[PDB]
């Protein structure tokens, strides 16, 4: 109900999320995926190679 | 005042602490020690082969 009222409201829904250090972020990916691995069971099926190009 | 009944105080503060996940620990100790270094400035100066052994 009143649809264009609501582009102010999902809009100040999406502001409200945190900010995110890049540094941090970036160092932590890149150590943490160096070596670690997910294990070769059938639930991870193909989940490793969505993560190779990362 | 009253030192004996400290005996009791000061180890309900003792098991207050927080628990420690070791195998997070360990995992991101070793991840984020491998390549990550200290600057070479006059502040850092032997601190770094404090965390050589390690």
Same mark, same amino acid.
């Given at each position: 109900? /009143?649809?264009? $009222? !609501?582009?102010?409201?999902? &809009?100040? /829904?999406?502001? $409200? !999320?945190?900010?995110?250090? &890049? ?32």
């Amino acid at each position: 109900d /009143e649809i264009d $009222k !609501q582009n102010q409201v999902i &809009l100040s /829904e999406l502001c $409200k !999320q945190q900010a995110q250090d &890049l540094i941090w972020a970036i160092r932590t990916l890149r150590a943490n995926f160096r070596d670690h691995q997910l294990e070769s069971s059938p639930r991870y099926d193909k989940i490793e190679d969505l993560f190779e190009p990362l």
